[PDB]
Scaffold this active site. Sequence first.
Site, short mmCIF file in Angstrom:
data_model
loop_
_atom_site.label_atom_id
_atom_site.label_comp_id
_atom_site.label_asym_id
_atom_site.label_seq_id
_atom_site.Cartn_x
_atom_site.Cartn_y
_atom_site.Cartn_z
N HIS A 275 39.68 -32.68 14.38
CA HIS A 275 39.25 -33.09 13.25
C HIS A 275 39.92 -32.88 11.96
CE1 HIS A 275 37.78 -28.94 12.00
NE2 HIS A 275 37.41 -29.62 10.95
N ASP B 145 33.63 -31.04 5.36
CA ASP B 145 33.00 -30.95 6.60
C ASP B 145 31.50 -31.51 6.45
OD1 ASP B 145 34.70 -29.78 8.73
OD2 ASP B 145 34.92 -28.29 7.22
N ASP C 90 37.40 -27.11 17.63
CA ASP C 90 37.84 -28.57 17.02
C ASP C 90 38.93 -28.50 16.26
OD1 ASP C 90 37.60 -31.04 16.01
OD2 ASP C 90 35.64 -31.14 15.39
N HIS D 148 39.90 -33.32 6.83
CA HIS D 148 40.51 -32.41 6.03
C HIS D 148 41.82 -32.91 5.33
CE1 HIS D 148 37.58 -29.06 6.54
NE2 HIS D 148 38.10 -29.28 7.71
N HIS E 296 0.69 -1.23 0.07
CA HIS E 296 0.09 -0.04 0.02
C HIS E 296 0.81 1.26 0.15
CE1 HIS E 296 -2.11 -3.41 2.06
NE2 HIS E 296 -3.26 -3.06 1.41
#
Lengths: 446, 446, 446, 192, 192, 192
Positions: free
Chosen positions: C208, C362, C205, C213, C104
């Site tokens: 990991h 990941d 982390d 990786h 509007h």
Amino acid sequence: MNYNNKILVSESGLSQKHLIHGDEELFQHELKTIFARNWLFLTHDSLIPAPGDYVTAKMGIDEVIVSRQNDGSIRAFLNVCRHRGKTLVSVEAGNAKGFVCSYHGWGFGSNGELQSVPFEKDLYGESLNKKCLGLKEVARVESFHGFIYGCFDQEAPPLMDYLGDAAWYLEPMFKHSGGLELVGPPGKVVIKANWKAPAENFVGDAYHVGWTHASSLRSGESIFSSLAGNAALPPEGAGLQMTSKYGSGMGVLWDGYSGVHSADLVPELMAFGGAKQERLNKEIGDVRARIYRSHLNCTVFPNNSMLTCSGVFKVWNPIDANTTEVWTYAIVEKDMPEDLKRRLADSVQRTFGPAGFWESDDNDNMETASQNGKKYQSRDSDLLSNLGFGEDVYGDAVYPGVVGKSAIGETSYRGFYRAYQAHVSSSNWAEFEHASSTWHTELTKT
Amino acid sequence: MNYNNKILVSESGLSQKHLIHGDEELFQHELKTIFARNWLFLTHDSLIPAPGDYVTAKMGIDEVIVSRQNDGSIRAFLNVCRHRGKTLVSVEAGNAKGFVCSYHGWGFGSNGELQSVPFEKDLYGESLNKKCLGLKEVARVESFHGFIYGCFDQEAPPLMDYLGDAAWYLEPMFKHSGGLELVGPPGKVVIKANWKAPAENFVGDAYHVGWTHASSLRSGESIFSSLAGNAALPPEGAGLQMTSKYGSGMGVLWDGYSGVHSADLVPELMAFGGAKQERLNKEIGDVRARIYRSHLNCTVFPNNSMLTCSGVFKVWNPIDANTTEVWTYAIVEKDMPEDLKRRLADSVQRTFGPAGFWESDDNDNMETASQNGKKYQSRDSDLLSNLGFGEDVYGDAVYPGVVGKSAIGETSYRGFYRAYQAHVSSSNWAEFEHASSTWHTELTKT
Amino acid sequence: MNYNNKILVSESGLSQKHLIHGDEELFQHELKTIFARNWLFLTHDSLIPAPGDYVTAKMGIDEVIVSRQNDGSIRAFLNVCRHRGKTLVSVEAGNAKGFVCSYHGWGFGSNGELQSVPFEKDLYGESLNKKCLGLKEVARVESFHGFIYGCFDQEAPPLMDYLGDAAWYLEPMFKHSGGLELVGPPGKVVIKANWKAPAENFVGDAYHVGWTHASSLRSGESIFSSLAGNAALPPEGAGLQMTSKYGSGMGVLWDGYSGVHSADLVPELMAFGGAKQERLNKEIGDVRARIYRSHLNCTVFPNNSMLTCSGVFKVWNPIDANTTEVWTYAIVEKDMPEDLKRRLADSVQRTFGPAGFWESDDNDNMETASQNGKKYQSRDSDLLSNLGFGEDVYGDAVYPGVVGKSAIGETSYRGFYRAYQAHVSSSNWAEFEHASSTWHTELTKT
Amino acid sequence: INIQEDKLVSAHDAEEILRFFNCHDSALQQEATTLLTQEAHLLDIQAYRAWLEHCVGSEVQYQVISRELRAASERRYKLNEAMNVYNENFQQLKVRVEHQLDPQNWGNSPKLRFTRFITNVQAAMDVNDKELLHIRSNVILHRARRGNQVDVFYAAREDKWKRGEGGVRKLVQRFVDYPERILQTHNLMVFL
Amino acid sequence: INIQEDKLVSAHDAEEILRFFNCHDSALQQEATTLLTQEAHLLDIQAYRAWLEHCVGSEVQYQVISRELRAASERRYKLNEAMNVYNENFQQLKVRVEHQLDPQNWGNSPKLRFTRFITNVQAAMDVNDKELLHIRSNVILHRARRGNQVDVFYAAREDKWKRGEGGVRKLVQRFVDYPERILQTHNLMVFL
Amino acid sequence: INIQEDKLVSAHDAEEILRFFNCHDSALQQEATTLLTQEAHLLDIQAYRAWLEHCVGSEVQYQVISRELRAASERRYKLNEAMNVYNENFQQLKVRVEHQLDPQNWGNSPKLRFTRFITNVQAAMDVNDKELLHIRSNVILHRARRGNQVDVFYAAREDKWKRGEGGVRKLVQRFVDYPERILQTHNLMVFL
Ligand SMILES: CSc1ccccc1
Ligand SMILES: CSc1ccccc1
Ligand SMILES: CSc1ccccc1
Ligand code: FES
Ligand code: FES
Ligand code: FES
Ligand SMILES: [Fe+3]
Ligand SMILES: [Fe+3]
Ligand SMILES: [Fe+3]
């Protein structure tokens, strides 16, 4: 919804509320009272015959690794790493002495034990209690003639007792035939139906065959083909129906050894089954030798179904109230010639696999019956399973279980849903037993 | 949420909580208190004129079969088999004396009766009580000048009373014009909006037209085109707004008989409507003859909308709180030349159909307003509908209902949401009536 | 679930129930107790530097407009029109003095004020109280060296206090380097993981990296590459871990200034960082100058993460319990040569952007760990974060916060989840503070 | 095709088949491929005026229908089988083009993204009008907007193309029978 | 291709590559495109009998497999690697065609809608059978039914085609290794 | 194209149009189709080393951008309009290829399945570099993995190809402006 009080299945299994095929809260409740409590199909010896062989399987919505141990036994474990919960195994089958997590490299044995942790000495020292960090193990794993089932509930009856009166009917084909093999890998397809829709259909639905499968009957030329378009009714004495305390049941169509197989396999199969039947007469008697070569449409409660002789073997894996992942294997008799086994397996998939033309006939029926259970005006409506009620018997001198002595009826629906209701309203196996102490009397009323 | 107590719509309909467009629990509650309770559009005589003609329609999330009976009446039934719940009819329209279920072959009449069951004698004997197994029937089916509505609630007011003060405005076009026909089949499209977003827009939103539809106004050359980009305000006395006890309402734009139609139809339509108006002056008086050829943007509560003269006819079929299936038909006057009817129908779809360029202007507005109702910081926010509040009247000597004597305002929003709140907080029609005994006083306050 | 009583995170943050990554009721609860309560990343000065510049951002599931005011400040507002709730701004960035609603036509200023309403005089007269109709404003907007955060909760600690002990570690790079710029626009991708899965991974982390990786380490030749396939453990003293009262934490890998960047950038970066470090020694001391050029993997609680030196900057925008929209920007030091900034930005996206090959490693880890939290047998299972427990310190003379003096451990998981549990079980900031009065003692037990 | 034997085939579909199975002209198939690829390129970059000027004939009928679902065995119910999602002459296409280009078409900001995939091209000259080229082709049309809205359309197109101004072949008829009855793409506001 | 170096490539895929990279025959690629477009047209209009008569050789093997997911490093587990979704001779295809055309195939009312997109066509004559034509092509197959059911299939097809009755080239082998392990299309009841 | 009149058309898109509308060379379009089909075949079977050796030039720029959503009327805000999802030289493509082939790329077990559909091929020689070939084409890329993960990508590709070692035409530039702003495919880890 109060599952202790809600009448989802009426007395004698005569009807069920349509919402059972649609209600997501009830689906969640079934995860606890049906799938975490009962025996579920995992695999066959023929698929994991050697030490280190494994497959993944669903048990309800959970995934498990099922592994052949060095000692010849089978153990099954949650497919979930004990460290931070990553899925351990991403393949469907293989051979390995263990499973290494792709996140932080924790190594689990085929026996579920935490065997190695990278740099454990430098990082954890002596502080990591690996003995308490084995994969979460399926409490019960048992075999029925090579067919391997699992149960998360330590309190369950042994698998053989759980099969109840259904075992007597399965043994001629599963045991006395010399044994079956499961031919993998399975077909896998998602359908938009509740798992109970195909489970109920396989357990007890001969009525649908001539009409639902009119086109497949007319086109394939199989031995049940006189049924196409309800052109003819199976004559008196053409078969029977049975059900059991723990919910398993089946139809028996006498002599139908070639099942749904097209005419290309009919002469060969009818010769093979008849020849073995002749040998079995001397060993297990005429009736049971006849059952061996009779078509059984069976559900092993809750969600494993089969068509013996046709050789179709199904798992209806639950996803949500209107989603089911259908696994389809072929079963063959071990002593069949290899070329026949190969053709039988292809024919199982041709008729009931991912592009199975028979199974396609069932799609709309199962999907819409399921989806209608969500619709507002249908939730409280009653699905009917009263066909043949008042004519079932128990304790027959020849055929055990609750038995309807007719080929077409709803006897096996009633037994399936009686057990279902008893589980849904119970907190444990002892309560199920209490709720089932007059199971056959309830089914044979009127 | 406690629907007895929760203020979802404030006094006088001045505002609504934004969560009403997003909350799935409330959507489920609306299935009971809005859709199972109120009159819903099914079809038109022109689409099922002959005995045996049928269509399928949605009523809320339920699907019904709507069938012309041999006696000339119309009956409607749940599209769900009484045996095991399969969807009976898979097509949208046709002609038949009955419907056979593809699962087990049960045959129902066009009158809903269970007429046949395959092999009934051999299977059920005399035990199947077919008289109690007719399709679940829609309790109330009534006609407003050929437009057929259904209601699941036997206690509802007659359709004519339910239309309340809105009927007076609809009659010149629906009755005195000689009658309308609905041109099918409808366009069908899913939008990611709550059903209330387009319902509220059609019932009472003239304010949006110049801005939302700036591009369609500029490009199409229709008769309301002076509004494009808010370049000009409709002059004083250009129209009015009305609302009614049971929630239906509309805007009236005086003389706008060619509506949204592009210049290619304007001269023809303005000639046709003016000629009929001249005849109607003598029959229904000058004011009502003028209303006949005036553009009405109307919602028949809850989810049926229309633009008379433009000829747009809509059903906003609810799927979930942010999903609506939009059905679009064209309405034409029966005595229009056939070639004009054809062009009018195409123009309705051109402007407001699945590729309607005007309707496309509304998409983002309805979808985002709806989806924002799920967002955490917006759930408890207030949607405003106060424009024109304190200037509405009731009981006017000329124009009935609660009326705002101006072309642009929010009068019809207030009446729509007043009725909505009264239903959501009520358990039955008697409670709605009790909650509505001062409906016009509430709307005309201040 | 009773969030006051339910132990979702065990004492000392040693474990968490797996359901926290899957439970939709808890996700909804997090909208209130995590996202509506805490500081969330919006934008950087470098993206809205001039008056009238704006961007849109998510804050939880809400969307806000973040605008540079004429006075140089930044204000943020819900991207929702105050009339009927339409989304105001449909673009991601731009420059404007205000925002006009496409429904509007209401016009809001860059300052959130309702400045104009079409035809206000003719329609509303003097009755519309525009002063009370400004956009719903984000209560708190603060800057940390150009990085702009917002909070809906007026009661929150100032952003600097909220960063707690983490600020000391961030300042060498965020402040003493001369300042950072954020390079936009961000990459945007949806992953099927809970927002906590990547948040926990970035906060703490290091374990990991060598395994997850392995392929990216082997293929890219970056400086942490000796880790590929867990071929080698980072030597003693290679780094540390820290956490803080309000949940933010990070790992520090000493000297790793080229981070994940492939060998093509290593010599240039190692030269640049070392040269600036030499200057910083005199200004902030040897330790803090070394921290400047050390790789920090950090989460600013709840859902903003970064890798300094690598230059990766992340927002984990929550959608539902298993859906997160990942925004990826690059951070660069302002005084780097422009050509280096350009190459650094491309390398950030090359490694961690929508086609980031490192980030791809990941995916399965975060998605399956999250999705397993919905599985029946895993909901009540315990995710472990006990690595290094009993060796953390607090109040160290050199390194502040709760600190684990080792490169690889779970110290920062414990602090993250301790704060998470304290918020989930609290109704407001005062209750969080009461629940956190012994935060460091709890983390350093045993 | 014998539609008494091939029970699922419509008379219309059988007629259209016959057109292409006969006189195959490889050069024509290649011309048609070029014509359609260039048309799709102009549409994809939202060069709608160029599309009208270069691709669309003054006498065009541009038609997309949605057919009501009826029983395969139905033979009594006779009412309107289809509605027109599009049924546009040149001036009506121009109106739609102006609507797309209007700076107050709020839905077009930020700019939409279109990608079209044209396949299965067949071409055959009309038997009786040696200047009328029949072209059949299938389209996948991908429309992306506003971050995460993605709509994919699938259709077969029955076209007639004819040489117009300057000898340029232009579209004089497009007919699409849209295969999905209920659209799940928010609208059909795309030029198939 | 050296599959010792290109570690992800299967022996089968490497062999199939070699077939097309060598003797390129442009005329053959065009013939193949025509053959496949016409086949897809017949299937799309559900002219299944015409498809059998015009496109399918009497000696056909029509095969679609679903391969079990196994570890890339797997070398001990030896059991059946795949199942046959289809593995049909001519008579078996005919059974499926009759099932489609049967008036009591309830699932085919209302009539289904098919649209096929054939791309990436390659063609090469067999080295040893100078009458055997190898054709490779990819298909997107869109099936719409019952208002809002939409299923899209994606596959690569390894075909052999050979001249049969009247010199018409017909399909003598189709092999598809279906790329999605778990179907999300309700079934695979379509002719790829 | 006049972009003052065709208000929705970008200068870049108008320039690219002009390239193909002029000197049409049918032989070139066919060469380009072959080049792209063979490239897609190598990628589909995950012959990434073969793709580098046979399809990718030493001087390649392989670029895929994601453009920030801005107002159609925007003319003040001047900051970086796009980010690079890919912006790779040959050595950077090689890194990505080694990452795909690494036996510790856990995400590649079980083996992924790729199917590419290349359509709308256009080709034109560069005006000034008579050895530079411009090729435009659209791709649908289907990636299936792990039972029930299915990701479909859609894009237009603006390529330059040039004769390299042994006279083999190789990719020296690919530019894709990815049409979806927020990816709904988990990542863009595919070679478009
Ligand atoms: C339940 S399926 C089936 C098929 C053939 C015969 C009996 C049952
Ligand atoms: C609510 S749509 C509309 C269109 C034209 C005129 C009035 C209203
Ligand atoms: C948490 S990601 C990461 C990457 C490189 C080094 C440390 C951490
Ligand atoms: S999640 Fe498996 S090793 Fe960490
Ligand atoms: S479900 Fe309709 S006849 Fe059985
Ligand atoms: S919703 Fe924004 S002006 Fe009305
Ligand atoms: Fe069946
Ligand atoms: Fe509108
Ligand atoms: Fe990582």
